[PDB]
């Protein structure tokens, strides 16, 4: 059956994914340099989007002022991969791909990346699933530099419960659709491990990741 607090808690969450926002005049802003700058501007903006999404998660603001920061550094990569997977699987997007291909990404990171995007777009996720899975990724207790783990673990728990009921209700036909999402969590860890390198092995125009990205991922 549906949850004790039910839709109420998920609707409070989904209005952070309502605030999920991209107003433009078709993005006025062709070249490997240019493509890089566009992607950097998208990443920086999605960082801002993600920071907002985080403060509104249950119990987040309360818990420790330093370890607060730690989760965002440790999870931002994974949230951005998830978001890109969502973006990449749409028709309304299609030439998002061209920018990532021609941006000077060392060749190894291409194929796995687009393969992960494909595994995501075979899972028929739905907003609620994207929102919840993103929240689960952010509140992962097993990230570098943390003292208050058990506390993170308790905020995470009820999100799993909600996600499990939602994946029975929406996708009963693929019964293990619940657990399959968790197996994308595992796979996100391979991208989080490689990212410091991908960035370092990134061919640009003698520049650097705009100050916020330089901080969140260091040096």
């Amino acid at each position: 059956e549906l949850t004790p607090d039910q839709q109420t808690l998920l609707h409070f969450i989904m209005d952070s994914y309502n605030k999920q926002r991209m107003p433009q005049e078709i993005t006025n802003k062709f070249s490997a340099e240019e493509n890089f700058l566009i992607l950097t501007e998208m990443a920086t903006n999605h960082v801002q989007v993600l920071v907002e999404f985080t403060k509104k998660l249950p119990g987040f603001q309360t818990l420790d002022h330093e370890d607060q920061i730690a989760l965002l550094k440790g999870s931002a990569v994974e949230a951005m991969f998830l978001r890109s997977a969502e973006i990449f699987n749409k028709k309304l997007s299609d030439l998002l791909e061209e920018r990532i291909r021609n941006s000077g990404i060392s060749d190894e990171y291409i194929t796995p990346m687009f393969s992960f995007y494909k595994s995501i777009g075979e899972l028929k996720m739905t907003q609620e699933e994207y929102a919840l899975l993103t929240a689960i990724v952010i509140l992962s207790p097993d990230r570098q530099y943390i003292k208050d783990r058990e506390a993170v673990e308790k905020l995470q728990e009820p999100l799993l419960d909600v996600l499990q009921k939602l994946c029975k209700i929406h996708q009963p036909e693929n019964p293990q659709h619940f657990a399959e999402l968790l197996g994308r969590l595992t796979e996100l860890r391979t991208f989080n491990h490689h990212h410091a390198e991908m960035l370092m092995s990134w061919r640009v125009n003698d520049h650097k990741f705009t100050p916020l990205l330089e901080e969140i991922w260091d040096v």
Partner: peptide, 8 residues
């Protein structure tokens, strides 16, 4: 440097 400037 923008660490604590995003919780405010």
């Amino acid at each position: 440097k923008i660490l604590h400037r995003l919780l405010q």
